[PDB]
């Protein structure tokens, strides 16, 4: 046997909170290219 006590700590004054630091939802990649971006016009002119 051993003797055991219980206490408490209230967050925000003695224990801090960390940020998320990551991404949870995966989601697919990005379609829908832009027709007003300068790079798109440059590559379109080059292709022409």
């Amino acid at each position: 046997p051993r003797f055991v006590i219980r206490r408490e700590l209230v967050v925000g004054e003695d224990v801090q909170v960390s940020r998320e630091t990551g991404t949870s939802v995966w989601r697919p990649k990005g379609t829908r290219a832009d027709y007003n971006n300068s790079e798109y016009k440059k590559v379109r002119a080059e292709r022409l």
Partner: protein, 268 residues
Amino acid sequence: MIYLSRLLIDTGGNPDRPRPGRKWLDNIYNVHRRLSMAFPSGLRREQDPHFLKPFSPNDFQKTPFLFRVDNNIDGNDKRAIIIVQSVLEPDWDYCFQNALDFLAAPPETKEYNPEFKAGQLLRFRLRVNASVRRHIPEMVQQDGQTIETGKILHKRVSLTWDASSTPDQALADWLAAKSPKLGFTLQRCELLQLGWVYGSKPEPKNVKVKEQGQGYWREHKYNPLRFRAALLEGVLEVDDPKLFLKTLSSGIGKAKSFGFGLLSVLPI
């Protein structure tokens, strides 16, 4: 031998519907390029039997062919005729296989072996580029005042006549001046049409360097093309059968790459 080919275009019908064939004739550069696409190389045709690959002029044969565009042919229908004279057999089924909308009739081709004796009368039709080369002072700006610059420009401009001379006389003299060398002598010459021919040409222009290297990014800039056109029809007489055949299949003026040199002869 010579190869003579004929193409037909509608240039009529409902004006509220697309007409690619009639629109194709608005630029002489496009017409010249399309006619040049009718002479493919022996390797390009084998590699691409359907003409569905990017177009590069380096894959097509170079040969000085001539052509003319005629209009106003009747029979209750409108027609524009393209007449092509060449030293090679054209491949029309390879050029128009994906553009059958352009034509109103199948292309026709035939052989041509013109043998003319000395002192023979002929009926001729031909279009000329009336151009002379001159030194011109450089006037610029014209922002309400004309400012002269000391440089003198070597420029090819239109043929001009005096105030007391008609254009027909000037053109007849201008053609009879050179007719000794070509190999024929005129008998009558009358002017039918006098005007301008327009076109536009693309040109590559560098813009920025490539971050990965090995080239630039490039763009297209358009350069105008203007020519002075005059159509003539009349009667001629062959001086010697040697130089006349050289005059044919060669052209009787400049701008021969834009349908400006072609002699059409009939036996009268």
